[PDB]
Design an enzyme around this catalytic site. Structure first.
Site, short mmCIF file in Angstrom:
data_model
loop_
_atom_site.label_atom_id
_atom_site.label_comp_id
_atom_site.label_asym_id
_atom_site.label_seq_id
_atom_site.Cartn_x
_atom_site.Cartn_y
_atom_site.Cartn_z
N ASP A 28 0.84 -1.18 0.00
CA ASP A 28 0.00 0.00 0.00
C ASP A 28 0.89 1.24 0.00
O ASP A 28 1.76 1.39 0.86
CB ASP A 28 -0.89 0.00 1.24
N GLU A 78 30.39 7.41 5.21
CA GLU A 78 30.47 5.98 5.50
C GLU A 78 30.24 5.31 4.15
O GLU A 78 29.86 4.14 4.07
CB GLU A 78 29.40 5.55 6.51
N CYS A 110 26.41 7.34 10.70
CA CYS A 110 25.84 8.64 10.39
C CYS A 110 26.07 9.71 11.45
O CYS A 110 25.46 10.78 11.40
CB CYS A 110 24.35 8.48 10.09
N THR A 151 14.05 3.41 2.42
CA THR A 151 14.69 4.52 3.13
C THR A 151 15.96 5.05 2.46
O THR A 151 16.65 5.92 3.02
CB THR A 151 15.03 4.12 4.58
N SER A 200 17.48 -1.80 15.53
CA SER A 200 17.97 -0.46 15.20
C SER A 200 17.07 0.63 15.77
O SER A 200 17.53 1.72 16.09
CB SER A 200 18.11 -0.29 13.68
N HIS A 232 18.63 13.31 13.94
CA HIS A 232 19.03 12.52 12.79
C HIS A 232 17.80 11.68 12.44
O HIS A 232 17.13 11.17 13.34
CB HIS A 232 20.17 11.57 13.15
N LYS A 241 8.81 8.73 16.45
CA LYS A 241 8.80 7.80 17.58
C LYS A 241 9.78 8.22 18.67
O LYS A 241 9.45 8.19 19.86
CB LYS A 241 9.13 6.39 17.12
N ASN A 274 17.23 8.97 3.29
CA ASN A 274 18.32 8.95 4.26
C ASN A 274 19.65 9.20 3.55
O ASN A 274 19.96 8.53 2.56
CB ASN A 274 18.37 7.57 4.93
N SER A 306 24.89 4.42 14.19
CA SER A 306 24.70 3.03 14.59
C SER A 306 26.02 2.48 15.10
O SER A 306 27.08 2.97 14.72
CB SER A 306 24.25 2.19 13.39
C1 LIG Z 1 20.41 3.58 9.12
C2 LIG Z 1 20.74 4.79 9.97
O1 LIG Z 1 20.91 5.89 9.44
C3 LIG Z 1 20.86 4.64 11.47
C4 LIG Z 1 19.56 4.93 12.20
O2 LIG Z 1 19.05 6.03 12.36
S1 LIG Z 1 18.90 3.34 12.77
C5 LIG Z 1 17.17 3.68 12.36
C6 LIG Z 1 16.42 2.46 11.81
N1 LIG Z 1 17.18 1.76 10.78
C7 LIG Z 1 17.07 1.99 9.47
O3 LIG Z 1 16.56 3.01 9.01
C8 LIG Z 1 17.59 0.91 8.55
C9 LIG Z 1 16.56 0.48 7.51
N2 LIG Z 1 15.28 0.14 8.12
C10 LIG Z 1 14.63 -1.01 7.91
O4 LIG Z 1 15.14 -2.11 8.08
C11 LIG Z 1 13.18 -0.89 7.42
O5 LIG Z 1 13.12 0.17 6.46
C12 LIG Z 1 12.20 -0.63 8.58
C13 LIG Z 1 12.35 -1.73 9.63
C14 LIG Z 1 12.52 0.71 9.22
C15 LIG Z 1 10.79 -0.61 8.06
O6 LIG Z 1 10.59 -1.66 7.11
P1 LIG Z 1 9.30 -2.59 7.16
O7 LIG Z 1 9.53 -3.64 8.19
O8 LIG Z 1 9.08 -3.16 5.81
O9 LIG Z 1 8.00 -1.66 7.50
P2 LIG Z 1 7.46 -2.01 8.99
O10 LIG Z 1 8.53 -1.93 10.02
O11 LIG Z 1 6.85 -3.36 8.91
O12 LIG Z 1 6.32 -0.97 9.38
C16 LIG Z 1 5.79 -0.07 8.42
C17 LIG Z 1 5.06 1.05 9.10
O13 LIG Z 1 3.96 1.46 8.25
C18 LIG Z 1 2.73 1.26 8.91
N3 LIG Z 1 1.76 0.79 7.93
C19 LIG Z 1 1.56 -0.47 7.45
N4 LIG Z 1 0.75 -0.52 6.42
C20 LIG Z 1 0.25 0.77 6.33
C21 LIG Z 1 -0.68 1.38 5.48
N5 LIG Z 1 -1.37 0.71 4.56
N6 LIG Z 1 -0.88 2.71 5.61
C22 LIG Z 1 -0.26 3.35 6.60
N7 LIG Z 1 0.55 2.87 7.54
C23 LIG Z 1 0.83 1.58 7.29
C24 LIG Z 1 3.02 0.26 10.03
O14 LIG Z 1 2.07 0.37 11.07
C25 LIG Z 1 4.42 0.67 10.44
O15 LIG Z 1 4.40 1.81 11.30
P3 LIG Z 1 4.76 1.63 12.86
O16 LIG Z 1 6.01 2.36 13.17
O17 LIG Z 1 3.52 2.27 13.63
O18 LIG Z 1 4.85 0.17 13.14
#
Ligand SMILES: CC(=O)CC(=O)SCCNC(=O)CCNC(=O)[C@H](O)C(C)(C)COP(=O)(O)OP(=O)(O)OC[C@H]1O[C@@H](n2cnc3c(N)ncnc32)[C@H](O)[C@@H]1OP(=O)(O)O
Ligand SMILES: CC(=O)CC(=O)SCCNC(=O)CCNC(=O)[C@H](O)C(C)(C)COP(=O)(O)OP(=O)(O)OC[C@H]1O[C@@H](n2cnc3c(N)ncnc32)[C@H](O)[C@@H]1OP(=O)(O)O
Lengths: 389, 389
Positions: A28, A78, A110, A151, A200, A232, A241, A274, A306
């Protein structure tokens, strides 16, 4: 005072619509638009590497006079392209900065741009007539169909640190917090990082809570003392959050203010993605240009890396700063980009991996006014310089 | 005053005789012994990576109190094992340093440790009760049968920068010089650097002359004002050439002194090899322990990094510094090493490339009192800690 005298960013000329990416990934659109909170993702053509993006971000903020006064050039990244030669050397060359300067790279995921500007300030204490150029440049690449793909981003942020800063004065109240954790890392040899999504998020919020608590304790300050907070952000949904977990105990007047400030801070990031080390500072630019904070007011900044390391510090807006931002140029930069299809994005992505040059696909003829990677001969990268030069 | 309060180094437990290496390479042993000026080459077992060598160099100079006062941990290296996570975080964890500190890596070939200690000093100017831990750690690997093989080496140097230093006060007279040049570099993906021997020598000497000239001009000083010079040592013969290029215009008394000081400065380096970012500081340790300089005397230091960046600065000896050095432990460290044949050296070398663990060949049972890489599970490195913990 010492602080940010000039600041500017650069992002590549292409982007992919998040709703389109969603459709191609069978999810979606709102999951991306609202779930993670991203609207458009920067796409990197092969002719833009961290060196050219960094130079492009800095070229518009350094004058002929600056070229003579810059004593240090620090590149935070990085996404390095060499294991020995600091990208700061090439950028120092490309920008025509005077020879008697230190050039080097800083690294810690980062988080790196923060110690760079903080130490730049310390270096400048005894040098009232010198300046420091700090450049955060990266390419957040997780891989096609990966969990972090949504991202992704690419770009660079350039900052000139100096005495009598026209925009922000850095205060001496920074406090950092280090904790060994494996939430995100990329061993030598790996093209894409290893991520632990759920973990993370927890590491991110803990680092922030721990740094803020220690800062509040040492300074005797509270959230109510900040006109806004700038963090960040790997993606806007994640930043929200972290904010909610901290202002959970602030007064209603403060919560409304900080929640509003946040939306202004992540405005630009929604259209880039990002960019690792540059994310916090791109958000800083967004806040300064999209909000109307008053001079003398204080901003609290949280930098995260991280691994992990977090740092909370504050800065104060300088009188007349609005006249030193480049809002028009920035909005123009983002608006002058061309949307590409998901299939096109995937082709660009695969070519970037092998650094396969194609003058036509990257449309280099349009890049006459910017720096770009034109070729690699005998393991040496060659760059095209702006026509103006 | 602010400067080096403590300094120590660590090299792996193995080494290969240079005369033996020469015989194996079909060349006159004197080419290596006199020609390049190296007697023994440090050999890296697989259980010693940059993180463990760095922790081993620092462990003997960090007290319980220090762990509470260290506010920053900086690792200088061009032998990183992760493209994102700074090795400083792991070392911070292994050494048990207080949580509220900054940890990050600095990079610029073999130059990195210098801006690290210089900035650590600027950082401490306003923080009277804090200290900084700087660690230069590297593995200079060129490849079997390569042009640079004879200059290989491995090790780490740890320094504690603090107020009222016990050994050396860093003066405020540093001048750096940057010039883009491809004398030595290592693009991402390459296991070994790309070198241009001839060019690298001229680049080195030019950087030294340009830095020295500007420094002499700015400070109104001359070589006659230095009790001794200390420079980056890729191999002892290279440093001899650089020195000879400038003392030509010096009095007979000064030439004898600086030549003599140089021999003391490179004593330890002859038995280790090139350790990149740590070379200059290993030479500094050698100078301080092998020569009998008097308190108040000034030492001139030249730091060099290919690419290239050079910096010349000075430091002054603190009264009573001899009581704060560890000559006995250092002599013991070098003496307690085991010589390995060239065949064994090649086996260790090839194993290092793929991090192939071998408890028997690396003889880990002997390493009960030091840190070492014990294993890698799921892309996460695990380290053994000294039994005394
Ligand atoms: C990397 C850095 O630079 C260092 C940092 O800051 S660490 C920060 C976190 N790490 C990262 O960013 C690394 C990459 N992140 C990831 O692995 C992934 O992108 C992620 C885990 C962040 C998300 O991927 P995902 O698992 O596919 O999506 P998911 O976690 O399941 O949740 C999707 C969100 O959309 C929401 N959602 C689901 N379907 C939806 C819809 N139809 N409409 C609106 N909202 C919806 C969910 O409720 C969820 O929100 P919540 O926070 O309330 O749970
Ligand atoms: C890498 C960094 O950390 C950055 C720096 O410092 S850059 C400065 C130095 N650069 C490097 O260390 C890069 C790696 N090194 C190399 O490329 C090579 O090892 C090197 C170019 C330094 C030498 O390799 P080589 O070609 O095999 O040895 P070669 O150049 O032939 O000369 C050997 C020396 O021994 C001498 N020699 C030859 N045979 C001899 C013999 N039997 N007895 C005594 N001397 C002898 C030669 O005359 C020569 O001395 P000089 O030229 O100084 O008078």
């Amino acid at each position: 005072a010492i602080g940010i005298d000039k600041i500017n960013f650069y992002v590549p000329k292409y982007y992919v619509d998040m709703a389109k990416l969603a459709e191609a990934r069978q999810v979606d659109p709102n999951k991306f638009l609202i779930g993670i909170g991203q609207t458009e993702m920067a796409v990197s053509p092969v002719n833009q590497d961290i060196v050219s993006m960094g130079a492009n971000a800095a070229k518009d903020i350094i004058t002929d006079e600056d070229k003579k006064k810059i004593g240090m050039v620090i590149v935070a990244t990085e996404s390095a392209v060499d294991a020995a030669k600091a990208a700061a050397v090439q950028i120092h060359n490309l920008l025509g900065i005077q020879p008697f300067a230190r050039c080097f790279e800083m690294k810690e995921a980062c988080y790196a741009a923060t110690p760079a500007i903080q130490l730049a300030k310390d270096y400048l204490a005894t040098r009232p007539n010198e300046k420091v150029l700090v450049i955060a440049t990266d390419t957040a690449r997780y891989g096609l169909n990966s969990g972090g793909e949504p991202t992704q981003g690419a770009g660079a942020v350039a900052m000139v640190i100096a005495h009598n800063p026209s925009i922000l004065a850095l205060n001496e109240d920074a406090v950092a917090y280090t904790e060994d954790v494996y939430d995100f890392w990329r061993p030598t040899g790996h093209k894409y990082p290893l991520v632990d999504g759920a973990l993370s998020k927890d590491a991110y919020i803990r680092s922030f809570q721990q740094s803020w608590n220690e800062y509040a304790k040492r300074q005797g300050k509270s959230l109510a003392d900040f006109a806004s907070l700038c963090f960040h952000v790997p993606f806007t949904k994640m930043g929200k959050k972290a904010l909610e977990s901290i202002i959970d105990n602030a007064d209603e007047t403060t919560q409304e203010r900080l929640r509003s400030g946040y939306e202004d801070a992540v405005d630009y990031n929604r259209y880039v993605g990002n960019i690792y080390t540059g994310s916090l500072y791109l958000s800083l630019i967004s806040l300064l240009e999209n909000r109307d904070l008053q001079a003398g007011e204080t901003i609290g900044l949280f930098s995260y890396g991280s691994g992990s390391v977090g740092e909370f510090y504050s800065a104060t807006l300088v009188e007349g700063y609005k006249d030193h931002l480049d809002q028009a140029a920035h909005k123009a930069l983002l608006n002058n980009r061309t949307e590409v299809s998901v299939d096109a994005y995937e082709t660009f992505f695969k070519r970037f991996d092998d650094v396969e040059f194609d003058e036509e696909q990257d449309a280099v003829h349009e890049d006459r006014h910017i720096f770009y990677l034109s070729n690699i001969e005998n393991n040496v990268r060659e760059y095209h310089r702006p026509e103006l030069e």
